[PDB]
Structures are given as structure tokens and as C-alpha cells.
Amino acid sequence: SAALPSIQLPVDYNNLFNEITDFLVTFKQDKGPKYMAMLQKVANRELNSVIIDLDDILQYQNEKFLQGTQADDLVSAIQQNANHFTELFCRAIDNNMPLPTKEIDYKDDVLDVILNQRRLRNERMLSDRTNEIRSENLMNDALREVVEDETELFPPNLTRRYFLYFKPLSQNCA
Amino acid sequence: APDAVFGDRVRRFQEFLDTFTSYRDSVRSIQVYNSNNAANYNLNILPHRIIISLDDLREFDRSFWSGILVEPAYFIPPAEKALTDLADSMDDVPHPNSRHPWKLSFKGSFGAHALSPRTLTAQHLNKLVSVEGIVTKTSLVRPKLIRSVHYAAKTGRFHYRDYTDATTTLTTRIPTPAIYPTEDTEGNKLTTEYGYSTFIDHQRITVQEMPEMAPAGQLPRSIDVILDDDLVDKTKPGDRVNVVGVFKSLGAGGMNQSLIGFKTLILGNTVYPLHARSTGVAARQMLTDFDIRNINKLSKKKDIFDILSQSLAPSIYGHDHIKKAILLMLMGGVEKNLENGSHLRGDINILMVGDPSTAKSQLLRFVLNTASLAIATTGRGSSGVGLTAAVTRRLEAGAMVLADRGVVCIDEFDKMTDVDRVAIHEVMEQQTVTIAKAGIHTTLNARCSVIAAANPVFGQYDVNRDPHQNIALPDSLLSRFDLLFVVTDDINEIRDRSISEHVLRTHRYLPPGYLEGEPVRERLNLSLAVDHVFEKFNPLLIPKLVTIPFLRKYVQYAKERVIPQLTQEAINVIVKNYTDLRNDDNTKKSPITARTLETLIRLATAHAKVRLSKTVNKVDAKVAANLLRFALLGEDI
Amino acid sequence: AKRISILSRAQSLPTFQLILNSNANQI
Ligand SMILES: Nc1ncnc2c1ncn2[C@@H]1O[C@H](COP(=O)(O)OP(=O)(O)O)[C@@H](O)[C@H]1O
Ligand SMILES: [Mg+2]
């Protein structure tokens, strides 16, 4: 505590992550949301790169301001410290990742089938913890929360097939 | 380097201090007191310490309260810094000739942290705990060098070095064994400047489980407590104590490769001497203005003496003049210290010789329970070694040395050895104990009033015989007793039925918060040595009876704020009564000596103290001589 | 014990100690 002292920075990452998720799910100004359309494409394996436009985030913040809601400056936070927001946006995309509408066939990449295999394996190990603890007979919320403490799953960075990039916000659109 | 959490806790405790204004009031009062006698003398300086009520902290911020109780090393330093900042903020008028660190002390309900040396285990380590026990050892109050100031004569410059140990902070530092500077950086020889270096008082006491709560037949448990710069000399060996402090672990416990286990002790934050019966701690009581007003209001009454006499032991029937004598002894006279060095005794001794079951021991137990400072002893249960001092190259105070400025209740006085009797002879008149043993020539103060109970030779006071044969005590010893009461169990029908109705009424008593068939609980009454005047339960059914706590308050007020002066109008009565008692032939129970003149004077002074009068008037001398004539003869005039 | 405690908290603990006793023959 005396060593490695704490500092008070104006950056709150919890509501910044909430804003990131809201922007990913609700932004549609560029038929539905642009970014879930892109994540749906990624799920079906037509795209392996996610480009996050800073113009889109700035426009989303401007629209939120126009309707009266006070939104944190996500664009400025990304510009000041961009390494953390690649990490953040990847987690947010993983949370809102649509299920693929195309099944895995023999013409898919080896990386895609490996990721599908480990995803199914970790969901099966979750289910196996759950069934074992149910058989032990010791609320489903607590049961689940025990399961994710006693599971060694594949982390999201190992079940991840896309790449994240930040397109700078245009000078005219600044 | 500054810590964000540290500042957050500092500002939270500053908010707490702002919410409860009593803490600015206390700090402001301390600062103005210090400044006022600093400017007065260019008495004593109050410490920079504030008592913090943990209940108020729990009301304000429960997590700050739980943080202090459970994680003191992370919550107490920020709170102390907040208090210091607040004190330096109010310090618009600095003392003549942040700064001046203010320490914190805690009080209130500790819950599971209120422990004893036996129940204080290793899972209480690094916690703020309140430990109740008995002080068995008090080390020497040794100075600790916290800053050494040196002088370099070649450069003519003053240097300094600050020293830090593991016990001065709640958090662990990096150890920095800075050596004592014997020379400057560049080779100049340094001279230590004592009087400019800073030394902090340090004491290490040992707190052991109290005998009244420790298991019988089992070896007691002890805990070390370290006191620094204002808690030193707050207690003495044998004192009941409540120490609030952080249960710290120190050293490495044998892990650091150079002990069986880690060295654990309590960093004392607060020391409360507790009042337990038959202990050496007096009973300070808080006297509000309402209490003083009531005391003066009752003192204005004429029969207040009687009101105080009957309210002593309502449960005991009769023994009314014995109760009057007991009240006078509780007040007592005023001792005289003449310029040449001689001493005149101002303490009243009482002896009660009587038949079995006339409540002599209940009247002793009541005095033990109600007196400000009372020690209970039994004949041959405590010897002269146990009554007076004892050499251990060091002295251990006995029964009558711990009871200095107090009362000694000796039961079974007749069953006392002559070796004890000679020491008692010295203690009663000269009020001193001269050891002169094993190279220790010391005169301890034993200014105590002795009340004692005794049985006759044959176990029944024979009215046919004379008192001198019924007592079987040395005449020189009986002279020291200011008032000797012989009580006889005479079988008379009126008082037989009256005492039996009283005994049954007392047995038919219920506390306000108890059921008809609920066993009354009983605690040990560990009072802190710092709401109606009259009593609802009256065994007699009649004047009014005051409550025992109010009677203790009245006795304390009269004892500490009234010093009566003898008057000629009282002296005439005293001299006439003494001359008559000396010359009149009446076959007195006790002999008449010059000590009788002084028991007249002492009783007159005590009764003057009862009325809150600063002068002994004629009525005080008359009532003193009246009680004395009763005690010597049995008259009712 | 971790499983039981977490499953029972909805209507950290240290390593548990094994206090084993027996009634077998005594040396
Ligand atoms: N005069 C009395 N009035 C009330 N209770 C009395 C009286 N005399 C004796 N007792 C009762 O007798 C019991 C024993 O008295 P105690 O003080 O032990 O006698 P002693 O002085 O002979 O040792 C107590 O419960 C006490 O209340
Ligand atoms: Mg007795």
C-alpha cells in the first residue's frame, strides 16, 4: 500500500465498457445496427477483421448528447490510451457475438474448426461441472457461479478469430 | 508517495469529524488550554489525543468503523492525519514558541474484539482489540531516541537524524538501520547535543487475565502492551485495566535465517484503569451540574445526616449510630501537616465487637462495595506482609498501602496475630509503614481509615462481665479505634418481629426488569475510573432514602470540595465534652486518652463535611460528642 | 467446503483442518 501507491484518474472503465457495448449494439446510422451486422458476418466467417470507426463513436456520442443523455467521451479515451480499448472492445464483441448461421464444413479454415472445437469443449466442460455438482446435491445462480470457479475453460482470446483495429476519426468529420 | 486510498480515507474521516462537532470542541479546548498556560508561564500540558466513540463512527460510516476495527493499519493512520489536519486548521492562534501529530484513542462497543488475554488468539492479529485484565508488570519508563541532534564545531553546524522502529507505526516500513552519526559526511567530528535531541517515553506493561474471571486452578494468560509518550505511568501493578490497541505481530518468528513463533504484542492506543472492589483503583465519578445542585439542595436540609445515615444500609435493620459513624468515616476529618513536619490524623477508625449475626460483616461488605477506595481483608488471611509492605530488592504494596487514602475493612479482627498487630499499631495513628528490611529503608504512606469487625472471647458478649475482659484486645490497640461499638443480640419481642419483617421484606424484592421466578443475574461491576436522587425500594416503612450511587456522589463532593475549619464555638463544646469524659467515672467501654480529644475533633470535622460547611459550628461538635458518648457508654441524649 | 459454502450462501475460507480421531488399540 505504501509501496505501489494508488492514483485517482478520471477514467472509469466500467461505464466506458458499458458505453462501448451500447454503441456496438445500438449504433445503426451507417437495415439494422452496423456493428452487429459486422459481427454476424464474422460469426459466419466472411470477415476476420473488425475496424472500429472513431467517426462512428463520435457520431454516436453526438446523438446521445442531442437527446439529452450525458455520455462519456469514448473517442478521447481511446485516443489517449488505445491499447486498453482494443482489449475492452474485444471483450464487448465477445459478449455480443451472434451465433453463426452457417455450419462448419470441410472448406473452412483449420483455425475456424479449432476455435469451434474448443468453444464446444468449454461449453461441455461447463455442463459437466454442472451435472456433477447437481449429482452431489449440496439456486441455479449459485450453481453456475460455482461452475465458472471450478472450470478451466479456453479463455476468450483463444476462441477469437477476428482482429480489431481503430480507424481514426476524419479531419472533416472531427 | 501519496496514495489515493489514503487520501480518500483521510477526507472521509474529515467528514466524520465535521459531522460530530464534539471533536472540534475537544481539540479546540485542548489547544486553548495548552496556549493559555504556555502564555501564563512563558500546570501541565494536555496531550494531543482525542477519544473517539466507535458507536458514532458506526452511525456515520459503518465500513470506516469496520475498517478501523478489522484493518486498523490502513484506517487509523488516515484518521490520525485527518485529525492532525483539522487541528492545524483550527490553530489560528498558535501556541507561544502536518505539524504536531495528533493521536487517536477509541471507546465504545467493540463486539467480538472486546477480549481477554486468554481469549486473545492469533486470529485477532492486526486487529483493534480491547483487552481487559490485571496489570502484573510495569517496566521502567525509558526514553527512546527518535531524533538525535549533533553539532559540528569545525563547520559550526547543527545536524540531525531521525530514528524509526517497528512499533512506532501500524504499517510495516522498509527497515532502515541508520547508524548513530559519530562524524559528519566529510570527516568532521560530531558532538551529541542532549536537550535538542528528541526522546519519547516508552513503557511495556504486562496484562494478565483478572483473577475474578480467570479459571480457577489454571495458569493465567498474559499479553504485552506498549505505551508511548502519553500512556506511560497511566497504570500501576495490580490495577484492573482495559487497554485498547492493535494486536500486532513483529519480527520474523524464526523464518528470517540468522524464534519458535512470531513475537506478538499490543500497541496500546487507550488505557482505562478500571474500578473493581478490593482493588487499588479509586472510583472517580462524573458530577453533572444537576448532581451538584441536588447535593447542595439536600445539604440545605437539617436532617440530611439522618437521611444519609438511614440510606447507607436500609437492608440492615437498626445499627443507626453505627451507620452514622460509617458515614462520618466515609467523609472523615482533615489531616494536619504542620510546618515542622508533624502529622495529625484525619481518618476515622471504627471497631465493631459483637455477637454472631448482628450484621458486622454485612456492614463491612457494604462499606467495601460503596466506598470510593476500599480493600477487604480477614484476620490471619492476610499477615503483616499481606497488610503492610513486603520486600521482593523491590517493594510490593500490601493491603494497607494499596488502600492509601481509602478504607480497610478487616473482618475477624480478633483472629489476628501480634506480629500483624504491631504493624497495625503503626498504621492506625502515624499513617505510615516503615520497612527497614534487607537494605530497603522506606516510609510508605498508609493514610487509610480502618473499619473492623470482631467477636468476643466466649463468642457471646456477657453483659454481666466488663468490656475489657470480653474484648481480649490490647488496650493500646483499642485506643487507636476512634469509635468502638459493642453490639449485643438481645432477644426482645418488638425488635424480634421488626427485624424478621425487615429480613422478609428484603427477601421479597424484585428488580425492575425481572420476572417473579427469574434468577437475578450478577456481573462483576468493572466500573470505569473516570437518574433519581431518592430510592424507590424502601425496606423500612419514615424519612426518605437516597440511592447508593447518589450517596457516593454526595460523599465524593463533600470529600473533595469541602475542607472545614474548626471554630471556637465548636472548640468550647469539644473541650468541655473531652474534660467530662476524661474525669467522669462511668465505666467506659473504651479508655479515654488525648486520642479521644482528636476523635472528637475528627468527628466534628466529618459532620461539618456532611453539611457541606466550611466551618465546624457548635452543632457539629455536639453531634460528634453525642455519637462518641453513645459509642463509649450507650447514652441516647 | 468451498462447494458447500458457495452453494449455501444463496439461502475466502482457508484450508480446512483434519481433526481425525479413533477408538482403536492405544500404544
Ligand atoms: N440487625 C440485622 N438487620 C438485618 N439483617 C441482619 C441483622 N443481623 C443479622 N442480619 C442478617 O444476618 C445474616 C448474617 O449476618 P452477618 O453479617 O454474616 O453476621 P456477623 O456480623 O455475625 O458475621 C445476613 O444475611 C444479615 O442480613
Ligand atoms: Mg462476621
Grid cell of B219 as nine digits: 495458569
d(CA B529, CA B556): 13
C13 touches chain A (CB under 8 A): no
Nearest by CB to C3, from A139, A141, A146: name it: A146
CA distances from B30 to A52, B19, B33 (A): 63, 19, 5
d(CA B604, CA B621): 5
Element containing residue B15 per DSSP (H, E): helix B4-19
d(CA B574, CA B596): 10
Residues B196 and B217 reside in one and the same domain: no
From chain A, the residues in CB contact with B175 under 8 A are none
d(CA B598, CA B278): 29
d(CA A164, CA A90): 7
Distance B365 CA to ligand 1 centre (A): 11
Strand ranges in B283-358 using DSSP code E only, listed in sequence order: 336-337, 343-344, 350-354
Pick the closest to residue B201 from B248, B168, B177 (CA basis): B168
d(CA B271, CA B260): 30
C12 touches chain A (CB under 8 A): no
Sign, Cα dihedral of B606, B611, B616, B622:
negative
Pick the closest to residue A102 from A47, A31, A163, A41 (CA basis): A41
The CA distance from A146 to the nearest CA of chain C, in Å, is 7
B574 class by beta-carbon count within 10 Å (0-12 exposed, 13-18 middle, 19+ buried): buried
d(CA B426, CA A8): 73
Chain centroid to CA B140:
22
Q: List % helix, strand, coil for chain B (3-state, nearest 5).
A: 35, 20, 45
Residues B196 and B80 reside in one and the same domain: no
Pick the closest to residue B407 from B234, B222, B283 (CA basis): B283
Residues B19 and B131 reside in one and the same domain: no
CB contact under 8 A, A2 and B173: yes
The CA distance from C17 to the nearest CA of chain A, in Å, is 20
Residue type, position B75, single letter: F
At residue B114, φ and ψ (nearest 5 deg) are -80, 100
d(CA B456, CA B454): 7
Residues B134 and B152 reside in one and the same domain: no
A10 touches chain B (CB under 8 A): no
Chain centroid to CA B128:
26
Residues B120 and B104 reside in one and the same domain: no
Q: What is the domain-level CATH number for residue B44? A: 3.30.1640.10
Residues B81 and B172 reside in one and the same domain: no
Write down which chains contact chain A via at least 3 CB pairs under 8 A: B, C
> Residues preceding discontinuities in chain C at C–N > 2.5 Å?
11
Q: At what angle do helices A54-66 and A13-26 cross, to 10 degrees?
A: 90
Grid cell of B376 as nine digits: 477487604
CA distances from A32 to A48, A56, A91, B37, B429 (A): 20, 15, 22, 81, 107
Residues B33 and B134 reside in one and the same domain: no
- Residue B148's beta-bridge partner residues? B161
At residue B485, φ and ψ (nearest 5 deg) are -110, 120
Angle, CA B441 vertex, CA B438 and CA B445 arms, to 5°:
125
Residues B242 and B127 reside in one and the same domain: yes
Pairs from A19-28 (Cβ < 8 Å, separation ≥ 24): A19/A71, A19/A72, A19/A74, A20/A74, A20/A85, A20/A88, A20/A89, A20/A92, A21/A92, A21/A95, A21/A96, A23/A56, A23/A57, A23/A60, A23/A74, A24/A89, A24/A92, A24/A93, A24/A96, A25/A96, A26/A60, A27/A56, A27/A59, A27/A60
Residues B223 and B260 reside in one and the same domain: yes
Query: In this structure, are residues B272 and B527 in contact, taking their beta carbons and an 8 Å threshold?
Result: no
At residue B338, φ and ψ (nearest 5 deg) are -70, 160
Q: Report the nearest atom of ligand 1 relative to the CA of B365.
A: 17
Grid cell of B283 as nine digits: 472510583
Judging by DSSP bridges, how do beta strands B449-454 and B350-354 pair with one another?
Answer: parallel
- Centre a 10 Å sphere on the Cβ of residue B340 and count the other Cβ atoms it contains: 5
Query: In this structure, are residues B249 and B125 in contact, taking their beta carbons and an 8 Å threshold?
Result: yes
**B491 CB-side CA count, 13 A:** 0
* Helix locations, B403-488, DSSP H: 418-430, 467-471, 475-480
- Centre a 10 Å sphere on the Cβ of residue B302 and count the other Cβ atoms it contains: 9
Site residues for ligand 1, CB cut-off 6 Å: B 316-318, 356-362, 499, 502-503
* Helix locations, C1-27, DSSP H: 2-9
Grid cell of B13 as nine digits: 474521516
Task: Name the residue with cell 455442463.
Answer: A127
Question: Residue whose CA is closest, atom 8 of ligand 1?
Answer: B358
DSSP B244: E
Domain boundaries, position B47 = 2-113
Sign, Cα dihedral of B325, B332, B305, B372:
negative
DSSP B142: E
Residues B268 and B206 reside in one and the same domain: yes
Give the method of determination: cryo-EM
- Residue B128's beta-bridge partner residues? B246
Contact partners, residue B238, CB within 8 Å, separation at least 6: B134, B135, B136, B279, B280, B397, B402
Judging by DSSP bridges, how do beta strands B263-275 and B240-250 pair with one another?
Answer: antiparallel
DSSP per-residue codes, B478-511: HHH-SEEEEE-----HHHHHHHHHHHHHHHS---
- Centre a 10 Å sphere on the Cβ of residue B99 and count the other Cβ atoms it contains: 8
> Residues preceding discontinuities in chain B at C–N > 2.5 Å?
42, 97, 258, 392, 530, 541
Residues B187 and B214 reside in one and the same domain: no
Nearest by CB to C3, from A133, A139, A141: name it: A133
Residues B193 and B101 reside in one and the same domain: no
